[PDB]
């Protein structure tokens, strides 16, 4: 009985299904698949990327940036939300294909740098090319690119350095306040008494205030039926999005339902 | 006039006193120098090490381990309180001599991985050589080794990876909880509104905190005189040394005393 | 038309067939698969491994290793012939669980550090955990664990770090010079003006040079059908074995051969 | 008796003298200091950099780049000769400042990544702040930047990574084959027999052979004096400049006597 072959990654289509890109805002632009957020915003002295989804998603990401008139070398700056391989999985080719450098916390950085294997809960499972970040940021701390200021708030849990970013771009002249919170969910992960995540609950608990206290007109989240998004129908995609509080409180109750069944 | 020349990270003369091992438990020694704490902890499958002090003392460090039977493959982990190069100095040079592997948090895997160079408030000027983390510790995490369970505590704010470290020996049968804390100090830094660290009063304050509630006996710090240790005396260098509460508690009024002055 | 999925790293069952320790000389062992080799060098001061297979292969390295009285914390030393995923996979898993250090060249450690990933040929279709190499050596430098004394030849080709291992051991007493020398395969390889490897036919027909003249008496290979090797058959392993010059003598009759093809 | 302070790396006064801006050719300029070689060339779709020497050279740098009309992020590549602190310095400091790449090869990635310490020959005496490769490149590999193409030509000896690069230049219409040529010296090596380096003595004679065969109108070296440059007289700076093959064989004659002498 021969040792078991490598499994790969497999996702559900839509995950993988390319779309063109969604407006958002006067200088946000939604660039990824239907079922996965990779965010671009147009500055006059570059672009910023906000996550890229699937590792294979290097090349349609480059399409729609093409499409906005953002040559490979206007990407100044990408930003992730968190290192794992369905948000992270094209930082490694963007970075060779782009020149753009990487801004990410300490926690995200050494997960980017060893591509998500050793995954605190899903070990070498979910693995992806490696990257390495070029910035090193805080909590609270302003990135700005082209007169656009990008606010980091951790939000651990998910993962370690699961990063919110807040922004304020314009409506037609109308400022908007978006917000990109992170995932708050905890798929198959043991709550209490992890011995690789031993303050995991506080974590959780004190990321849960964190994103109702955003700053946030219009929420987006890495999976956009998290928030309520319905990248398909375009012009209703913001429809019946949720707003930070009810995301919250929503993926709080998930939490605690989630820890009273494991103490069972 | 031409560019200035670069300056050298020079200390008194006594952080680079040599100094024989010193014994603070049945297992615990202090092979550092007189004003420089490097512990070293005995077991049954290994020694390890907290600290290394200043980059030019891993040939003293290696000779007082030596004398006290340990080889240089017994070395098996080295522990650390905060990546700067009067503290992590030498465990570059220590990991290619001994054959170790080095145990940190992100923050001060990051910080160990550049040398300490990029300080948040020092920049470039305080440069050791650089060197690798092996496994990435969370806040709360158990590391053991030959029996003896090392606790981590993160109290971050001198640098975002301060660790404190606990574990629990023996006084000749008789059990003794040791919590090696890391400095409480803020030289010369900008606490308020610092772009570099915008959250760090919070942290400052949450580590007092922190220490506070630290399950201690007996209390080392890497300048054993923030928790008046004095190495010089041998036997009696635990005689006046501070509590937990006492330390933080004379951090704390320090730092509001120096909060106080940067608002005028 | 949804993007594809991610494709694993498939191979033939029988490189996973798990074998238990075959022995080679007096220090050396086979404890890998019947079609992967894991050399294991049993030293007065520690144990030494080349190469580790596939990395679902941990479990098994470390099963082998404790039936020859080798502790974890017994293995000192990793060295590779070449970092792809079906001879360094476990490396990172190994390093986790064993404390051991890592000894490669550069062009090795930079494929190791990023996982096998951006492979000069074969891109990001072979991904394993990344891992870092502790020790940089030279073409030429010797390696000392335990009184044995590995000497590394560099014979770059199939990667640009393909590095051979010579070292003597012991057959009851009488001395045994063995070389384990990489492969010298180019599979699926585009030879002739290749823009990632400019060199590449020079550096092919340099190695070839380089293991006619390795000081070998028994020769080994990573593939050990490449050197005629049979695991199965136990006893019998080195029957049919080649030669140095034999090996290098078919292997550069291939690649005229190949890039005769390729030129048409 | 204390252990001794650090000793920081001073270098001459004529190191650290800046100079405005010296035009090469139509798209290469001088922009270090008198003694220390930095070419930056500026292309229609960026600028790219060779070298920064001393690491506190920055500043100059940038207000060189400023003047010649070059922003920041206008800087898309940085190449390098070999990662010592008198060339290499600035790069960790540049990278943070224009978001510009690095490109290097594998031995010159790991001496950069390590900031130049644990040399094979200065040890941790020459220690500059590190930085990492974002791209690897190969032997004879070509990297082209806005429409300029640079071909790289591994001369290892001075260190194993040692560069030199050739790109085609503009005289006013009329082409010209520039040669930035690494440094050819052994200052203080130990040739024979070093055990960090024992194939030290073949790649310094094939490098010799390497700078004979290089495509060269106009050659420079990192530091100007080796190839006759003299950046003080501006218009008569290619004056009395060698060729090729007389800046090998008068450093091949420095070597021969440099290895008699040792080997007495
Ligand atoms: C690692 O990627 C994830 N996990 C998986 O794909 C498998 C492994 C799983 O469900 O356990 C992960 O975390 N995600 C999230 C998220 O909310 O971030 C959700 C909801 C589930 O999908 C991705
Ligand atoms: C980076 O090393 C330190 N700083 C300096 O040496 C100079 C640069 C300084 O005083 O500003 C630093 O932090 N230390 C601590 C500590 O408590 O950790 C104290 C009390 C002061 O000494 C070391
Ligand atoms: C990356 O791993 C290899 N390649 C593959 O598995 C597929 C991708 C392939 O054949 O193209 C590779 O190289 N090997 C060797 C070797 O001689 O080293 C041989 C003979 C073939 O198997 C492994
Ligand atoms: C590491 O920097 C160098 N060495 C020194 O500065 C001291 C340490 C020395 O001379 O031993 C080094 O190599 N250089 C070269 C070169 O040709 O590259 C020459 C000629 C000498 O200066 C620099
Ligand atoms: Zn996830
Ligand atoms: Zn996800
Ligand atoms: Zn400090
Ligand atoms: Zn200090
Ligand atoms: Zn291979
Ligand atoms: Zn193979
Ligand atoms: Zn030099
Ligand atoms: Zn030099």
Same mark, same amino acid.
């Given at each position: 009985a021969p040792l078991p072959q490598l499994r790969a990654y497999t996702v559900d289509a839509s995950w993988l299904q390319p779309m063109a890109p969604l407006q958002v805002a006067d200088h946000t632009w939604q660039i990824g698949t239907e079922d996965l957020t990779a965010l671009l915003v147009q500055t006059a002295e570059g672009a910023v990327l906000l996550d890229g989804g699937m590792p294979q998603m290097a090349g349609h990401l480059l399409d729609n940036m093409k499409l906005r008139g953002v040559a490979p070398q206007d990407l100044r700056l990408i930003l992730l939300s968190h290192a794992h391989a369905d948000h992270a999985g094209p930082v490694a080719e963007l970075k060779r294909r782009t020149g753009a450098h990487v801004a990410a916390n300490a926690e995200t950085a050494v997960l980017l740098a060893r591509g998500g294997? !050793?995954?605190?809960?899903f070990g070498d499972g979910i693995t992806y090319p490696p990257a390495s970040a070029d910035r090193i940021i805080m909590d609270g701390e302003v990135v700005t690119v082209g007169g656009i200021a990008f606010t980091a708030h951790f939000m651990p849990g998910h993962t370690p350095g699961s990063t919110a970013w807040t922004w304020t771009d314009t409506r037609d002249g109308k400022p908007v306040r978006i917000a990109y919170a992170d995932s708050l969910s905890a798929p198959g992960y043991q709550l209490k008494g992890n011995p690789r995540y031993p303050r995991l609950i506080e974590d959780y608990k004190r990321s849960f205030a964190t994103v109702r206290a955003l700053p946030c007109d219009l929420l987006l989240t890495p999976h956009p039926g998290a928030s309520n998004? !319905?990248?398909?129908?375009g012009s209703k995609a913001s429809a019946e999005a949720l707003t930070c509080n009810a995301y919250a409180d929503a993926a709080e109750k998930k939490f605690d339902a989630q820890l009273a069944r494991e103490t069972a």
């Open positions: 294997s !050793n995954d605190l809960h998004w !319905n990248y398909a129908v």
